[PDB]
């Protein structure tokens, strides 16, 4: 869920408030997304949107009526590393991994304020 | 909460159903507990009851109206090891550790069916 993803990105970027800093960035970081990623942080977001859309094709995920930003899973953050728990059932485990990967991606790319609240005419 | 503790003990003992196998064992494994532990598994349970009672003295825990078996925290199980997450606030982090320790204790001691549903006249 949204609230596990928020903490995974602060696990990796402790100075950040992910829901403010990474929301509404580029063409993909945020609800939906279309067009060409404007940079690498945006490409991180596009890959995560594709991961979430892959998750929805999983038959395990067909039973999950709570769709991905409300679908709760388990993970821990320890010494700024993220671990998806084995108690996750297959669907939750797929979304956890989607989230792990996007948070780690976000910590490896530049952040460009120019792209914050980027006008949609760009996507 | 009860449901995080159940999974921590299956993290460590994967063949088990903790809520059936360790409930109502000796004088301490179960709600409450008084008397002398009948064995080492029971002493594991006494130490965990003392941990939970220590937790209740914490000032952090004073705000937690949901008392410990409903007080949810985060942890992961990976390769049969348990890790209490850093996103746990202090109270939850104290209970998580109480639970980590009891699950690891339960995996290191003998299990004695004689003590299963042990008559209270014994405690
Ligand atoms: Ca998006
Ligand atoms: Ca007890």
UniProtKB/Swiss-Prot annotation, chains A, B:
Q: List the disulfide bonds.
A: 11-77, 27-123, 29-45, 44-105, 51-98, 61-91, 84-96
Q: Which family does it belong to?
A: Belongs to the phospholipase A2 family.
Where does it reside? Secreted
- Subunit structure, as described in the record: Monomer or homodimer.
Q: Which residues bind Ca(2+)?
A: 28, 30, 32, 49
Q: Explain the post-translational modification.
A: Activated by trypsin cleavage in the duodenum. Can also be activated by thrombin or autocatalytically.
What are the GO cellular component annotations? cell surface; extracellular space
Q: Which GO terms describe its biological process?
A: antibacterial humoral response; antimicrobial humoral immune response mediated by antimicrobial peptide; arachidonate secretion; defense response to Gram-positive bacterium; fatty acid biosynthetic process; innate immune response in mucosa; lipid catabolic process; phosphatidylcholine metabolic process
Span within the entire protein? 23 to 145 of 145
Q: In UniProt terms, what function does this protein have?
A: Secretory calcium-dependent phospholipase A2 that primarily targets dietary phospholipids in the intestinal tract. Hydrolyzes the ester bond of the fatty acyl group attached at sn-2 position of phospholipids (phospholipase A2 activity) with preference for phosphatidylethanolamines and phosphatidylglycerols over phosphatidylcholines. May play a role in the biosynthesis of N-acyl ethanolamines that regulate energy metabolism and inflammation in the intestinal tract.
**Known catalysed reaction(s)?**
a 1,2-diacyl-sn-glycero-3-phosphocholine + H2O = a 1-acyl-sn-glycero-3-phosphocholine + a fatty acid + H(+); 1,2-ditetradecanoyl-sn-glycero-3-phosphocholine + H2O = 1-tetradecanoyl-sn-glycero-3-phosphocholine + tetradecanoate + H(+); 1,2-dihexadecanoyl-sn-glycero-3-phosphocholine + H2O = 1-hexadecanoyl-sn-glycero-3-phosphocholine + hexadecanoate + H(+); 1-hexadecanoyl-2-(9Z-octadecenoyl)-sn-glycero-3-phosphocholine + H2O = 1-hexadecanoyl-sn-glycero-3-phosphocholine + (9Z)-octadecenoate + H(+)
CC cofactor? Ca(2+)
Q: What EC number(s) is this enzyme filed under?
A: 3.1.1.4
MF-aspect GO terms: bile acid binding; calcium ion binding; calcium-dependent phospholipase A2 activity; phospholipid binding; signaling receptor binding
Domain of life from the UniProt record? Eukaryota
- In the record's cofactor note, how is the cofactor described as bound? Binds 1 Ca(2+) ion per subunit.
Q: What is this protein called?
A: Phospholipase A2
Record: active site: 48, 99
């Amino acid at each position: 869920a949204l609230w596990q993803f928020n903490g995974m990105i602060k696990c990796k970027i402790p100075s950040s408030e992910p829901l403010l800093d990474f929301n509404n960035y580029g063409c993909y970081c945020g609800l939906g997304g279309s067009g060409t990623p404007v940079d690498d942080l945006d490409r991180c977001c596009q890959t995560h949107d594709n991961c979430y859309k892959q998750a929805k094709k999983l038959d395990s995920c067909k039973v999950l009526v709570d769709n991905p930003y409300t679908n709760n899973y388990s993970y821990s953050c320890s010494n700024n590393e993220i671990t998806c728990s084995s108690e996750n059932n297959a669907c939750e485990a797929f979304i956890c991994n989607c989230d792990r990967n996007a948070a780690i991606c976000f910590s490896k790319v530049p952040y460009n304020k120019e792209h914050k609240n980027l006008d949609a005419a760009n996507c």
